[PDB]
Every structure is written in C-alpha cells, then in structure tokens.
DNA sequence: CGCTAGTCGACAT
DNA sequence: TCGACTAGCG
C-alpha cells in the first residue's frame, strides 16, 4: 500500500459509474468487500459464534454488477509472500493485541470499547473467503484464488486483456501497471477511475509516468516490500527520478544525496531490497487462468536469474496450483476442502 | 513545504 | 485488504 499516492496524483482521477463497462469483463479485489463486510459483524467473529452476514454483504456488490451486465472476476488472496512476512507478522501481532485487549474489555463491562478492538482484530479467514465463493458460484459468477497476494493476480488478468478493469481499493495495483483501476465504489456503483494512459496529466510526475519510473517511485515512497528510507516520500522519490538522467537504477539510488542534497546514508541490504521489491512488482507468481499454470506476473528478462527469486513466491505443480485457484485445497493445511470442478459443466 | 506516525474510518440501525 | 486525516517534525 502506496500511502497517499492516490491523493498524489488526483489529476488523473475522474468519477464514473460500472455502467461504462457493459457487457465486458471486470475483475475484483473481493477482499475488500470482506473488511468492509466483517465489520457490520465484528464481535460475532471475534467470538467464534456463526455469522454469514459478510456473504450476503459481498453478494450485493455482486448481484449489483450482474445487473449492468458485468461480467465479474471474483479474486482472493492465497498463501503469505515471503516478501511481506515482515508486514503479515505485524498485522498477526496487533489481531492479537486488539483481540486480547478487546476480551479484557468484556471482563470489565465497555461495550463500546470492546468492539472498537474487536473490529480491529477482524482476520479474514480462508474459509470466511470460501464461503462467498460458493455463493458466488451458486449465481454464476466466475472465482479466483491467487497463488499468493491477490494484486499480482488483478494485475495479470488485466495486463492480458482477460478483464479490462479492477475494481479495487489499494493503491499498489497502479504500480503493478494496471491498465484501469476502479477506486471508492460504493454499493451504488460509483467511484473514481484512474487510466495508466491518463498519468500525464499529472504535472507532479514530469517524466515518471512509464510503467518502470512510476514503479520505482512507489517503493522508494515506501510499500508494503520495502520501507522507505527516512524522509522520502512520493514527491522527493518523484523528484530523483524526474531527475534521473541515467537508466541504470542502482546508481540512482545511491546518489540520492545528490539528487536532492541531503545527508542520506543507504545501507547495502536496501540496495539488496530494493532488488528484491522490483522483482516482486515485475516476477510474482500469478496463475494463468486459460492455459492452468503457474507463471510471473511478467514474463522473466535475460538480466534476471529466476532461481533468486523466492521470495516472490514458490512454485508448485501445476495440478496443486489449479487446486489452490478454485478453492478446493486449503491455503495451509494443504488439504482439499471442497470438490469443484470447472470442466464438468475464465477457464 | 514534504515526510512521519498515530488516529479514525470502512458497517449500519 | 487497505486508505483518509492531521499534528508534529525537518
Ligand atoms: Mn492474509
Ligand atoms: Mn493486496
Ligand atoms: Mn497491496
Ligand atoms: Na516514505
């Protein structure tokens, strides 16, 4: 998550409505719809007692783009990347922190305060996720499992011409080259639409608006792969790369005191990061719907070594990695948990 | 002015 | 899964 880069380039923004893609193919970042979703049900879930209110919240969303002719890809998260354990084990850390501090809260006699923990410590489970993706195939609308982080996976359907939109709330889809992002939708349908084409207008950005520069601004800024060093955010890390007459990245980076004369020191494991964020952005390993394989978000230049690459994801058989994608094989028992198939009537 | 970190919000009755 | 917002700092 790119931290206020959409109020960084909001010359490239304008309200629409889903209606402006008719009859074509949208894909969804449906974990979002689950957080918001959870939330309405919070202390039922922080209790362990039922609740399928959440799929009912996700179904209207859907139902709704049904209505407009939509055609959507329903995309969720799957395994934890190696790239953002350090983030998922912080998150564990504070879902814990609210839910212990929350069940305290229950022995004393806040209600108010109690839930406000309590919905700080949702935790989309995978089965909370596999519970609207049968509904949502009990209606006929198409459900994937990423084989890791559901925005690699937005990015490819999207990059393939697959689906030409996606309606989602992070911002790291734009640096992963998303052609059309769809932002603040609402259950009505509107929100704001950002183009790849359309990052010109933004006068901030000067040059960096190709798909390479606009990716190296966004984790020099800080994302969720690598932090940023301190005191660089999106407009210094805009003003480097403005500035950058070199294509070499590497050397940029290390003349950042120069570019902008200050007293920065990087160490060598952040250039090493740095690397390593990049590859993640470019080689993540998505799923190819049509051809059922697993594959890089982009395909892998000759300057780059795959077998460095695991931190952007581990490969599997293509069979277990198909079974991941419909649902059928549990994120982390590894177990198949239910039966679906898609031949025996995206794919 | 730009960046950082904490807070409040997302639901809906 | 995220971001919007502002006070406090350089
Ligand atoms: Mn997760
Ligand atoms: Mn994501
Ligand atoms: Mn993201
Ligand atoms: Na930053």
């Known amino acids: 998550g790119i931290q206020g880069l959409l109020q960084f380039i ?3 923004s304008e309200p629409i409505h889903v209606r402006k893609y008719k009859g074509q193919v949208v894909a969804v970042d449906t974990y979002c719809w689950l957080h918001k979703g959870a939330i309405a049900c919070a202390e039922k879930l ?3 007692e039922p609740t399928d209110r959440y799929v009912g919240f996700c179904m209207k969303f859907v139902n709704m783009l049904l209505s407009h002719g939509i055609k959507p890809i329903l995309v969720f998260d799957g395994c934890t990347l190696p790239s953002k354990k350090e983030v998922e084990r912080s998150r564990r850390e504070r879902r814990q922190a609210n839910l212990l501090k929350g069940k305290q809260l229950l022995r004393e006699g806040k ?3 109690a ?4 919905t700080r410590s949702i935790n989309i489970t995978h089965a909370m996720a596999h519970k609207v993706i049968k509904a949502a195939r009990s209606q006929g609308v198409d459900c994937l499992v990423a084989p890791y982080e559901a925005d690699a996976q ?9 689906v030409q939109a996606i309606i989602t709330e992070d911002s790291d889809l734009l640096a992963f080259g998303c052609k ?5 939708m609402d259950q009505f349908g509107n929100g704001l639409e950002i183009d790849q084409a359309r990052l010109g207008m933004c006068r901030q950005l000067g040059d960096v608006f190709t798909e390479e520069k606009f990716r190296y601004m966004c984790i020099l800024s800080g994302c969720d792969y690598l932090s940023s060093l301190r005191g660089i955010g999106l407009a210094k890390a805009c003003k480097v790369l403005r500035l950058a007459n070199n294509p070499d990245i ?3 980076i290390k003349k950042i005191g120069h570019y902008l ?8 494991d952040y250039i090493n990061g740095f690397i390593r964020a990049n590859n993640t952005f470019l080689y993540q390993l998505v799923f190819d719907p049509i051809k059922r394989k697993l594959i890089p978000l982009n395909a892998y230049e000759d300057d780059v070594d795959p077998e460095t690459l695991s931190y952007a994801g581990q490969y599997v058989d293509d069979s277990i990695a198909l079974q991941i994608a419909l649902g059928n094989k549990d994120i982390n028992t590894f177990e198949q948990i239910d039966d679906y198939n898609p031949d025996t009537a995206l794919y």
């Open 10 to 12: 909001k010359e490239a």
């Open 46 to 48: 922080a209790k362990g």
């Open 111 to 113: 209600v108010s305060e």
């Open 115 to 118: 839930r406000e923990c309590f």
């Open 154 to 162: 937005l990015a490819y359907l999207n990059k393939a011409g697959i």
């Open 180 to 184: 059309k992002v769809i932002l603040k």
């Open 250 to 252: 590497v050397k940029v």
């Open 261 to 268: 004369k200050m007293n920065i020191t990087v160490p060598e």
